[PDB]
């Protein structure tokens, strides 16, 4: 229904790089369905893509409280910490991402980058 | 009104090559308005664009039950059969398309291709 | 809520050059929220982009009754009259546009074009 339409609009907007429109659409989705883990996750991505890492972190966290079994969320949480030079936290979350999804090449590369920093 | 929004979102998604999103949106439109022939037709196109010809066929057929006088639907039904090498069926539907719309070149070209196979 | 969704869809469609979809979406938005000046304005732009200048004019006019302090709207109203050869009206609205936004060099150029077309 309308929340699903809002969600689809946000995804479409996101995929086309219209992050402000994605955010406004995901907000409508979340107003209607506040416990939608995937909407929080995607709102997080939209903020991430705009360089707003603190907001991304907050919404990734919210998504993971609702659904901790989202490997990609753990991974992006890692990235957002990495981009702020919080290498400890990035390492913790990349590792959690890999515990859930050992095949995430990207998380493995970034884990390695983060481990090499820190020092 | 919600059905129209769903439909517009599906068209937008389709036009931009986001077929999965188009399908999900058109399904919401059809849930609200199951007699919308153009939504069935477009759902068909979205599946066609993804290479899922059997599904495309099913939805083209549904669209044509609702609007049998719609030459473009007959034409796309033809194409979907053609892409699966069902040349007999493609010929029947291209011909039906042309019986309704003697112009539209494309169905005429494809009819010729199919007949040659 | 539905009005906002319709509006977001219209914006998204507009930004991507899908003007027919934008028009249909903005119509739904305005049906739900007829006092949205920015929706009237954008419906106007969508019709303008399609070459439907009489419709553009109608919706610009509506937008400006609701928000007269929108300089860019006065300017586009001017353009739409210009494209139909209503040079008097184009001149009046370009002038109004400049009274509100003296830095609109485009409106100044077009004002000059219109003044020339009419002798």
Author numbering:
A (entry chain A), C (entry chain C): 1 to 119
B (entry chain B): 1 to 117
Sentences from the paper on this structure:
In the first step, we de novo designed antigen-tailored trimers, featuring N termini geometrically matched to the C termini of the viral glycoproteins. In the second step, we generated tetrahedral, octahedral, and icosahedral two-component nanoparticles by designing secondary interfaces between a designed trimer (fusion component) and a de novo homo-oligomer (assembly component). This design approach yielded nanoparticles tailored to present 4, 8, or 20 copies of the viral glycoproteins in defined geometries.
We chose to design our antigen-tailored trimers from monomeric repeat proteins composed of rigidly packed 20- to 50-residue tandem repeat units, as their high stability and tunable length (through variation of repeat number) are desirable properties for the design of protein-based nanomaterials. Geometrically compatible docks (non-clashing termini separation distances of 15 Å or less) were subjected to full Rosetta C3-symmetric interface design and filtering, and twenty-three designs were selected for experimental characterization. Four of the designs that were trimeric and expressed in high yield, 1na0C3_2, 3ltjC3_1v2, 3ltjC3_11, and HR04C3_5v2, were selected for solution small angle X-ray scattering (SAXS) experiments. Structures were determined at resolutions of 2.6 and 2.3 Å, revealing a backbone root mean square deviation (r.m.s.d.) between the design model and structure of 1.4 and 0.8 Å, respectively. The structures confirmed in both cases that the designed proteins adopt the intended trimeric configurations, and that most of the atomic details at the de novo designed interfaces are recapitulated.
